[PDB]
Write a protein that binds this DNA or RNA. Structure first.
Ligand SMILES: [Mg+2]
Ligand SMILES: [Mg+2]
Ligand SMILES: [Mg+2]
Ligand SMILES: [Mg+2]
Ligand SMILES: [Mg+2]
Ligand SMILES: [Mg+2]
Ligand SMILES: [Mg+2]
Ligand SMILES: [Mg+2]
Ligand SMILES: [Mg+2]
Ligand SMILES: [Mg+2]
Ligand SMILES: [Mg+2]
Ligand SMILES: [Mg+2]
Ligand SMILES: [Mg+2]
Ligand SMILES: [Mg+2]
Ligand SMILES: [Mg+2]
Ligand SMILES: [Mg+2]
Ligand SMILES: [Mg+2]
Ligand SMILES: [Mg+2]
Ligand SMILES: [Mg+2]
Ligand SMILES: [Mg+2]
Ligand SMILES: [Mg+2]
Ligand SMILES: [Mg+2]
Ligand SMILES: [Mg+2]
Ligand SMILES: [Mg+2]
Ligand SMILES: [Mg+2]
Ligand SMILES: [Mg+2]
Ligand SMILES: [Mg+2]
Ligand SMILES: [Mg+2]
Ligand SMILES: [Mg+2]
Ligand SMILES: [Mg+2]
Ligand SMILES: [Mg+2]
Ligand SMILES: [Mg+2]
Lengths: 117, 101, 154, 138, 113, 59
RNA sequence: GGUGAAAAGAACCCCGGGAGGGGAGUGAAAUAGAGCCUGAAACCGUGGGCUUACAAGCAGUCACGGCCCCAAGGGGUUGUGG
RNA sequence: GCGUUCCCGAUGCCGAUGAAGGCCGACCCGCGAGGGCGGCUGGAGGUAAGGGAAGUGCGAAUGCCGGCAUGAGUAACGAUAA
């Protein structure tokens, strides 16, 4: 018996092409330029998923700094103050307190420079 | 009020009545309520009061519909002569409805 | 690529065409071309240990019997090989047709009778074999045959 | 889950006169201001720092020797011309640039950075004929 | 209501006719004819000609009424190329392809308030 | 078939971009005092001819 | 190589020199209309939504924001930042 | 492990209340290869569980056959006897 390609290949191709929808030239039109583009896209996303975790760290840290430097002191001092005070709190993430409810943050600052006074 | 709960190794600002996902909890039934760790006050007329891991007795009560959900992503790794797709990760989620501070 | 109808002339200079290097168009990169590891005529038979054949035939009947599906008949009121007749007979025999039957007898006539029935697989006694035995739900043999069987193995 | 993001904010002008200052130590500040790194709304994709006007360039002090010492290569013409002009000279002739070059230099490279630099207004002061909000920072 | 025409296998090259079809897309039939009338291009002939047929059809088959109608959309599509040999130096032999057009005009009626 | 030769299939985009100037200009046209007609300016045309005009024919 | 069960293969009228098409008519079906079953892809077009003329690129990806079809969410698009 | 062709299973079963194949899908299952389910097309085939056998999976071979692009509305249109 002969088993010719038959359907198979077209289908495996459409699969890839479905994924490549939106890309520029034949990167979205060519059942292989597409596949090339897709490899990269995979790696970039993996790389970038890890990146995201850091991109935000940074926002935050800059968030915090501007805001507590606003009550006169380093992010670094602030953070050490906190550490020294004990405050699993914040999580650089949750100094959005820096923005909504400053009063909270303000107090946190005092606590921070408290354990540094 | 307010409150900064800690769960799933992550912390969130939980409000009078809401939710998002937290990560599979052994709270086997949907029809249940766990209280999670408090961590900073809230500022309203009920307080404004933080503290060293807020182990101040106070809890946040949250009930929760849910099911270890999923989603999508697809984690493809690639080199040169080496490819690996063998990751559709979805990721167990846990939905919730926070009840009171 | 040899079995193929073409010539063997080499199609291009091989060296300054600016096309790919090629021989004759028989070669299987060619379409025109010949098949690569195609099937050839071959003999799929092999000598399965006589003993195993015996064991099997025994094992097979055995099985059918440990189920209560083996029946040794004797009465064949069916004659001249007439389907009507075998039918009626199979009736007050228990064989209603809701079950595929391998009828085994040496009786040329009972063969003819039971033959054309879709739910029956008629067979001489020297024809007894496991495939057929297993194909079918119920097993029915005239002692005539049950002896030759009992004699293919004692 | 959370997030942070700001809704369009009204920009806030600002006036500074580092007439006596070391450019670059000044300029460094002027940048941080340009991108809003001082505000705790800060969002990197969006452009929302003060506007920043500066009267009295000339004036800007500069450390060691930059009498024909600090040389602005800056200009590659096109065919055989790498025009270089010593610091003295800039000040001597359109001196507002000294602080401009400085600030543009410490601004990010993209379209946005390109945009923030526009938000900087430098005049060889005093007098920034140009303000209807000037709020002096120091 | 619209009325359409289509000339199939016209045997001018698309790029070439499209050019004039672009000229009349969305004009009053009046404007359309005028334009084609004095458009210096082989394609003029053809396109105009199928314009006319469209108009006919409209009026005649779809009680549509001349005075009111314009070119709703138009467009040319490639048909199957006629492939001819064209012999070259050092006896090379290229294939020139005389292409072939499928011109389509569809009129609608304009206003009345 | 020889010396200079293009190094890349040119993208649809770039092809089309080149043709941003190829669009046709509609013929320039006018009344004609005698016919309700349309003719190019500065031409006699197949009817109207002219006032003291030469042309097909007129009564 | 292949219309259809059957030529029932489109009378007649309309534009056109014709080709071609529009009606009419046959057909269960005519984007089954005659190199006609199915009719993928490259490729060419028409319409629409988002987008674009101070911008630097393996063309993706990550985050935010805006606009466009359904509503604690999705889909399409892409301005800026990484 | 997945999937392709074929055999047993099959005098069966699914099928015009629509097979195969094609086009969608932001849904369900699977780590994945895939498998489903829904809509449209399509119009006559398909073929479980469990096994058996192979012409069994393509992106590259200046591979092969074919189709269609790019250069491009470009060079050219074959004696300057008009
Ligand atoms: Mg193959
Ligand atoms: Mg290597
Ligand atoms: Mg030979
Ligand atoms: Mg030889
Ligand atoms: Mg070569
Ligand atoms: Mg070559
Ligand atoms: Mg052959
Ligand atoms: Mg063998
Ligand atoms: Mg039978
Ligand atoms: Mg020759
Ligand atoms: Mg060519
Ligand atoms: Mg285009
Ligand atoms: Mg037939
Ligand atoms: Mg169809
Ligand atoms: Mg059909
Ligand atoms: Mg058929
Ligand atoms: Mg067809
Ligand atoms: Mg378009
Ligand atoms: Mg500029
Ligand atoms: Mg712009
Ligand atoms: Mg750009
Ligand atoms: Mg980017
Ligand atoms: Mg076959
Ligand atoms: Mg049925
Ligand atoms: Mg049904
Ligand atoms: Mg099949
Ligand atoms: Mg092979
Ligand atoms: Mg390979
Ligand atoms: Mg080829
Ligand atoms: Mg050229
Ligand atoms: Mg030229
Ligand atoms: Mg020329």
């Amino acid at each position: 018996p002969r088993a010719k390609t038959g359907v198979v290949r077209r289908r495996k191709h459409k699969k890839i092409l479905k994924l490549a929808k939106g890309y520029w030239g034949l990167r979205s039109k060519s059942f292989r330029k597409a596949r090339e583009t897709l490899f990269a896209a995979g790696n970039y996303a993996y790389a970038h998923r890890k990146r995201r975790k850091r991109d935000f760290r940074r926002l935050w840290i800059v968030r915090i700094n501007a805001a507590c430097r606003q009550h006169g002191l380093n992010y670094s001092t602030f953070i050490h103050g906190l550490k020294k005070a004990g405050i699993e709190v914040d999580r650089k993430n949750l100094a959005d307190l820096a923005v909504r409810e400053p009063q909270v943050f303000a107090e946190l600052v005092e606590r921070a420079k408290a354990a540094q006074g | 009020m307010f409150a900064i709960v800690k769960t799933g190794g992550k912390q969130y600002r939980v409000e009078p009545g809401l939710k998002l996902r937290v990560e599979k909890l052994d709270a086997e039934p949907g029809a249940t309520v766990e209280l999670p760790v408090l961590l900073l006050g809230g500022e309203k007329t009920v307080v404004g009061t933080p503290v060293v891991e807020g182990a101040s007795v106070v809890a946040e009560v949250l009930g929760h519909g849910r099911g270890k959900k999923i989603l999508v992503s697809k984690f493809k790794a690639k080199v040169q002569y080496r490819r690996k797709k063998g990751h559709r990760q979805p990721y167990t989620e846990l939905l919730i409805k926070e009840i009171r501070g | 690529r040899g079995e193929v109808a073409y010539s063997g002339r080499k199609i291009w200079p091989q060296k300054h065409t600016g096309r790919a290097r090629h021989g004759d168009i028989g070669a299987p990169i060619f379409v025109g071309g010949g098949v690569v590891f195609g099937p050839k005529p071959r003999d799929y038979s092999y000598t399965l240990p006589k003993k195993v054949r015996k064991k099997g035939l025994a094992m097979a009947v055995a099985d059918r019997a440990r189920e209560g599906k083996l029946l040794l008949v004797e009465a064949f009121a069916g004659v001249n090989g007439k389907t009507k007749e075998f039918l009626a007979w199979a009736k007050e025999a228990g064989l209603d047709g809701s079950e595929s039957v391998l009828l085994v007898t040496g009786n040329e006539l009972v063969r003819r009778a039971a033959r054309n029935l879709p739910w029956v697989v008629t067979l001489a006694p020297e024809g007894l074999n496991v495939y057929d035995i297993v194909r079918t739900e119920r097993l029915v043999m005239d002692l005539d045959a049950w002896e030759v069987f009992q004699n293919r193995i004692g | 889950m959370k997030t942070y993001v700001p809704k369009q904010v009204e920009p806030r002008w600002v006036l500074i006169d580092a007439e006596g200052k070391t450019l670059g130590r000044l300029a460094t500040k002027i940048a941080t201001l340009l991108r809003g790194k001082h505000r705790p709304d800060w969002t990197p994709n969006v452009a929302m720092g003060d506007f920043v006007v500066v009267v009295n360039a000339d004036k800007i002090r500069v450390t060691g020797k930059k009498l024909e010492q600090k040389i602005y290569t800056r200009y590659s013409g096109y065919p055989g011309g790498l025009k270089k002009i010593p610091l003295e000279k800039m000040l001597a002739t359109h001196p507002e640039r000294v602080l401009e070059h400085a600030v543009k230099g410490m601004l990010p490279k993209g379209p946005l950075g390109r945009r923030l630099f526009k938000r900087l207004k430098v005049y060889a002061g005093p007098d920034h004929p140009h303000q209807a909000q000037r709020p002096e920072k120091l | 209501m619209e009325a359409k025409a289509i000339a199939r296998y016209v045997r001018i090259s698309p790029r070439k006719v499209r050019l004039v079809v672009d000229l009349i897309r969305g004009k009053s039939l009046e404007e359309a004819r005028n334009i084609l009338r004095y458009t210096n291009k082989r394609g003029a002939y053809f396109v105009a000609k199928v314009l006319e047929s469209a108009a006919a059809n409209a009026v005649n088959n779809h009680d549509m009424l001349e005075d009111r109608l314009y070119v709703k959309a138009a467009y040319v599509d490639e048909g199957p190329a006629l492939k001819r040999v064209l012999p070259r130096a050092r006896g090379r032999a290229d294939i020139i392809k005389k292409r072939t057009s499928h011109i389509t005009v569809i009129l609608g009626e304009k206003h009345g308030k | 078939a020889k010396h200079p030769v293009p190094k890349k299939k040119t993208s649809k985009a770039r092809r089309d971009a080149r043709r941003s100037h190829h669009a046709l200009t509609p013929p320039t046209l006018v009344p004609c005092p005698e016919c309700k007609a349309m003719k190019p300016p500065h031409t006699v045309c197949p009817e109207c001819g002219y006032y003291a005009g030469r042309k097909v024919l007129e009564v």
